Assembly symmetry: C5
Amino acid sequence: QELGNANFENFIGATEGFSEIAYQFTSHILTLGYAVMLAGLLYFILTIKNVDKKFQMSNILSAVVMVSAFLLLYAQAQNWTSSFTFNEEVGRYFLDPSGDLFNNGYRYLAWLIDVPMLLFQILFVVSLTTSKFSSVRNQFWFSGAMMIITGYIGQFYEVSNLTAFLVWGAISSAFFFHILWVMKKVINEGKEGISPAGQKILSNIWILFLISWTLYPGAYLMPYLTGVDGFLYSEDGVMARQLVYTIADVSSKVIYGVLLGNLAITLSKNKEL
Amino acid sequence: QELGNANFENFIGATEGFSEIAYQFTSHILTLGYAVMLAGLLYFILTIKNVDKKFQMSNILSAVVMVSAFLLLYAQAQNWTSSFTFNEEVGRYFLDPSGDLFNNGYRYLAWLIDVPMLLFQILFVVSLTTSKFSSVRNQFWFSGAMMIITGYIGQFYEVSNLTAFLVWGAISSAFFFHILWVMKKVINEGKEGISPAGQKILSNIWILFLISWTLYPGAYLMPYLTGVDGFLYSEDGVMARQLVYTIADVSSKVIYGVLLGNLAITLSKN
Amino acid sequence: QELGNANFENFIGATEGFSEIAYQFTSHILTLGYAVMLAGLLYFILTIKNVDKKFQMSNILSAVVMVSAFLLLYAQAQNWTSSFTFNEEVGRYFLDPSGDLFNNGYRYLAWLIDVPMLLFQILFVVSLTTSKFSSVRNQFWFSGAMMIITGYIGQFYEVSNLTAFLVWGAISSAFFFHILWVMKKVINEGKEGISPAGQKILSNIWILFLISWTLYPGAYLMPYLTGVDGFLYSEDGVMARQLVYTIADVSSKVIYGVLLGNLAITLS
Amino acid sequence: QELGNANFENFIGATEGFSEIAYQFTSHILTLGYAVMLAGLLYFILTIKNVDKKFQMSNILSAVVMVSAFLLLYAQAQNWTSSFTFNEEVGRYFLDPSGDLFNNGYRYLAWLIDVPMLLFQILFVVSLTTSKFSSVRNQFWFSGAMMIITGYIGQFYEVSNLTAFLVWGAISSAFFFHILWVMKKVINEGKEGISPAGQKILSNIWILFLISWTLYPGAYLMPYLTGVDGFLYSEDGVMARQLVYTIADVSSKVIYGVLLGNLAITLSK
Amino acid sequence: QELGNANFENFIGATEGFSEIAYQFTSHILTLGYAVMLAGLLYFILTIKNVDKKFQMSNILSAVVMVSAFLLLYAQAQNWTSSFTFNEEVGRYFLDPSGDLFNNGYRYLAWLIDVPMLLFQILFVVSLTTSKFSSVRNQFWFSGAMMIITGYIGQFYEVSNLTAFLVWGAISSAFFFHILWVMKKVINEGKEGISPAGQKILSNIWILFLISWTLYPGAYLMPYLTGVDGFLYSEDGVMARQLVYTIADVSSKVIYGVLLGNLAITLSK
Ligand SMILES: *C/C=C(C)/C=C/C=C(C)/C=C/C1=C(C)CCCC1(C)C
Ligand SMILES: *C/C=C(C)/C=C/C=C(C)/C=C/C1=C(C)CCCC1(C)C
Ligand SMILES: *C/C=C(C)/C=C/C=C(C)/C=C/C1=C(C)CCCC1(C)C
Ligand SMILES: *C/C=C(C)/C=C/C=C(C)/C=C/C1=C(C)CCCC1(C)C
Ligand SMILES: *C/C=C(C)/C=C/C=C(C)/C=C/C1=C(C)CCCC1(C)C
Ligand SMILES: CCCCCCCC/C=C\CCCCCCCC(=O)O
Ligand SMILES: CCCCCCCC/C=C\CCCCCCCC(=O)O
Ligand SMILES: CCCCCCCCCCCCCCCCCCCC
Ligand SMILES: CCCCCCCCO[C@@H]1O[C@H](CO)[C@@H](O)[C@H](O)[C@H]1O
Ligand SMILES: CCCCCCCCO[C@@H]1O[C@H](CO)[C@@H](O)[C@H](O)[C@H]1O
Ligand SMILES: CCCCCCCCO[C@@H]1O[C@H](CO)[C@@H](O)[C@H](O)[C@H]1O
Ligand SMILES: CCCCCCCCO[C@@H]1O[C@H](CO)[C@@H](O)[C@H](O)[C@H]1O
Ligand SMILES: CCCCCCCCO[C@@H]1O[C@H](CO)[C@@H](O)[C@H](O)[C@H]1O
Ligand code: NA
Ligand code: NA
Ligand code: NA
Ligand code: NA
Ligand code: NA
């Protein structure tokens, strides 16, 4: 069947189809996804006044990211259940083109909000030393945009053109490495002149940032992580991808925002929690 | 009909179908479910300033749980009405696979939010004595996660593989017993150094916690609580399961959060 | 055809069908219903700080009831338009079982929130004298639950089994009479030791409570209030039922909550 | 094609059908409608503390009206797109009875909230002189209810029974004239004892009130304003009706509420 | 197939259809659109108290615009996915008339809120010198309305009548030039009496305003920017149009509102 430049979920759904567990779990994990984000939105708004005025922009930017993540994860949850329909004869869920093909591209364009804001918000909690605020922000935003746009293009070809998929993925990775480099500097400078408690939290933020952000390229490659005709090029890979995205999203956005909020509390003159 | 690793609601819906009462009630009880949660969300936000600053995180976490519960119970209410469609000839609601099979798994993964937050929030009202905050939190979260994940896997097999269903259910129960054990300690230490009024509320919280949380494994086993081909392996069992879930949800989340709020008030200097 | 234990709306919709006016009005009155509740929600939140801290719980509980009523009335509005579809040949709206049968049961289980909270909230404005707070609350909640659950069961049989319908309805009425009795006591004790202004408002609250709450059993019996094959056992009865529910809901929840808020202001 | 006691939009949609422009515009104007109301809701909440406590009830009642108007205009926007479906052969949108017949009745019952609250809220900004607060409120509410209910009944017959349509419309107009009379008194008394700036705003409120409220009976009669088989008894009349409703709604609710808010500011210490 | 006075997206969708990338991207960019607006709504509400009371109306008006933009961009995102359906045989998305024809007109009527409020809100941050507040406001609102209404009419003819399309577009452009002229005056007077930092921000606001607002007529002409049977009269042009709209919307509404907020902060004591 002719699917063109479509995500591998559609090829699995169109040929093998999805078992009850594969279809239900993907739906459940996406639902948890958007549930977490709307819960996070409420948390970040309600905890604004727990930190000094100077730090509250970080809470606001966390909230901004929650709204974006919620809307996108909600939309993507609906796209999943629309794109795959139960076949009574074989008892599996197959591609339902009437619901449109499933595409992860929704997530990517959403990142155009998330990435810039997540990178930006830490600069409202930590004080830079040697690096200039405007410089770090511009590097984050430029490399953030380029990372997303190049990855966005690549993922359309994840089945139709493995070469384009890997080249665009490679280019995207370059910009990612640059972001990791800059965020490392920001963490280091942020540690300078603050309590050991605040330094400990920034150490945790860096580990969280490194793992959670690396999961995204992992999700990108998921179908081919077990090579050609591998275990992962299947419904199991489809489940894995959306699980990894959901773990990444919760970690990179919510847990990240909570740690920043806790850092803001330690750096606050009035608050001591 | 080939349903695979599907919940028993789908087997009842596909064979016997659901009477008007069975279908309507299940829909009504799920609707009440999400209505209560969105009402609770408003209550917990509006009562934040009724307790001292240090206790307000408990109100916030209650609110967080309400958002999760509302979204999931709302989604599950829609999944119910999508999965079962009226047949004019026989006058019963039968499985409509076009709406997807009904699965309780939505609820389970939601618990990944609810359980950790419900267990966590009490540690913002009560003061521990001998137990370390970080230690209790880690035990709650680990055993909470494992309880849910193992139960989640099990419930897929509640018809297709009774053995897998019971083994995973058993493993889940172990983690549940651990949570009960730790929450007992937390309640006891919480009682130390507070007024009799506060101690009374914690006693109520423990009874509420014990009964409400035990209902979940009850809902898990519901179809087989009257044995093979029993009274409960029917639309009556389907009704019972969603009723028990709804009672459990209201009790474990809303009533729990209200009692914690009342405890916070007694512990408040204002 | 076989409808089983279904509400009479489905039998009218399946046999005679609904005229444009009957179908449209039922949809309009249900829409007004949920519109009023979401408007009320905003009113009750925005007026919280108009009364002393001790009374603000009443505003909060009003808000809680608005969220419940909005969600349920909204759902019920959608259920109405899903359950009845236009037939081009005859130009009437007939039962569309693909949308599910219409059931008022949604409203009933919602009352499990509304009734307990509406009864509870007055105990945050008025001071009891002889009656114990906990005692009144428990009586309200128990009799409230039993009234709803018994009525809920009964309304499933409003066509399929007139006997079960009337028996369950009768049992429900008993619990209702108990609630009326207890609320009367609460009003009387509430009047003791407060300004004439506060006493006037409580007098109004009692009249409102009595009429608005009595409309619900009226809506219950609506199809048979004109007896067998009566004027009301028709689309006109379907319209009447949802109108009475909507009047009752607005009165019992919104107007009630406003009067309590006004009482709270005089006592502040 | 038996439509019975249905609005004229359904007869146009069932016979001639709607051009792309007619169908799209009606959808766009209704969408703008509910967009304005939800935007207004946010405005009225966010500006509550811009006036003295005594005037803030007017902001709250504005908000209440916004919630009502938003919900109704949103529902009516969906009803429009559900009731008329594109026919590929002729390239026009025809009545799709599966979506239900289109009815303006949704709006009318909504007015049971809007009218009483809009009339009520001015009594929280202006001070009466001769007239008693309770008396004016009761007159507004009674005549408001009767105006809406009689008009609601009438509009069902706007095609099926022109006589019933005009009689009920006439009775409704009587109650409307009473409301205009009372609101005039309220404006006059409101002007007494306030700054010239406040008097100017009330003069604007009266002009706004008079024009915006008169548009509703205009929308009522729209199909027949060019007589039997006139230019307006067509998709152009359908467009006109919903445009007039939307202008009226924005004017009577949002602009009205803004002017009252501005009056409240001038009267604030 | 008879489409009449329909947008070119429908002609591309009805003839060649849309590739996976073209259909998915258009859907993604519209989704990003409304996501940004709802995120912006939260930002503008939460940052109200970051500026002095006198400037807070600008935050409120930013919020008002976010509500409008969110609702419309959300509706337009749904209209896109409703109007084009996958064909299994050829593996492309074709016009699905059952979902209604796609029309950008939704956006235009929304601008009736956005344009007046965006132009208005700057007058709550900057101080005019020689120009009268009321005069600037009236010029903005009149020319704003006329620009939108004339463009709205024109875009219905973008395929059916190229002449009407260009004439209405031309008339619209005249009103646009007037708005640019007035906003220039406002920027100049705004710079007078404020710190160099505030002047720098206003300079950026003017550049942002000029580029972002010019994108709209660009989106209008998009299908014909490569001439008849050009590269852009295709799915690539459809993608381009919605991309440009989304860049314009984010720039003209959100970034604009942020810069105004930053200006308000520098002007705050
Ligand atoms: C909440 C959203 C976040 C944190 C998004 C992060 C996105 C990435 C780190 C993406 C990285 C990618 C690569 C390094 C290669 C393949 C393409 C991407 C965009 C998935
Ligand atoms: C509001 C959500 C709550 C309190 C969830 C609680 C969940 C449980 C106590 C689950 C227990 C289970 C077992 C002990 C065995 C079977 C599987 C479970 C997960 C249902
Ligand atoms: C806003 C919800 C309210 C006030 C609900 C009130 C419900 C009743 C008073 C119900 C009464 C009934 C009977 C007395 C007999 C028939 C069954 C009932 C439940 C409708
Ligand atoms: C925002 C809602 C408002 C201001 C509603 C106003 C409604 C009217 C002024 C209605 C008047 C009518 C007549 C005078 C005759 C025909 C029937 C009516 C109800 C449309
Ligand atoms: C957020 C909404 C904004 C800023 C809207 C701006 C709209 C324009 C600048 C429109 C301009 C047009 C022309 C100059 C000619 C063609 C028609 C228009 C309306 C697109
Ligand atoms: C599976 C992940 C579930 C997480 C739920 C997300 C919604 C709520 C988010 C965070 C709540 C955690 C509260 C942390 C409190 C930190 C201590 C402090 O503030 O002093
Ligand atoms: C069969 C299932 C296998 C995978 C299950 C593993 C899930 C583990 C989940 C949660 C671990 C959380 C416990 C420790 C968290 C403490 C973090 C902190 O200190 O803030
Ligand atoms: C401080 C100035 C006081 C003015 C208050 C007037 C309220 C304005 C309402 C919103 C904007 C109205 C005009 C919008 C632009 C024109 C759109 C109409 C097209 C027919
Ligand atoms: C860094 C990760 C790159 C690994 C390269 C994986 C090569 C995958 O190879 C592809 O696998 C598909 C399904 O498995 C097959 O259908 C394709 O024919 C095949 O080209
Ligand atoms: C308390 C937990 C243990 C209960 C185990 C009950 C065993 C049920 O046994 C099962 O019952 C099904 C429905 O009746 C049948 O269809 C299955 O064939 C049968 O294996
Ligand atoms: C209010 C309590 C009195 C109820 C007694 C009314 C008896 C109605 O009787 C019923 O009327 C239905 C409607 O016409 C018929 O369809 C049934 O056949 C008939 O049993
Ligand atoms: C302002 C008061 C309006 C006067 C009544 C107008 C009389 C219209 O009369 C009606 O016009 C319809 C329009 O086509 C025709 O279809 C009807 O047959 C005709 O009765
Ligand atoms: C000033 C902006 C440039 C306007 C150039 C108008 C020329 C477009 O010309 C048009 O191109 C369409 C696309 O193929 C064709 O379908 C039409 O037949 C053709 O008239
Ligand atoms: Na599906
Ligand atoms: Na159903
Ligand atoms: Na219908
Ligand atoms: Na349509
Ligand atoms: Na589509």
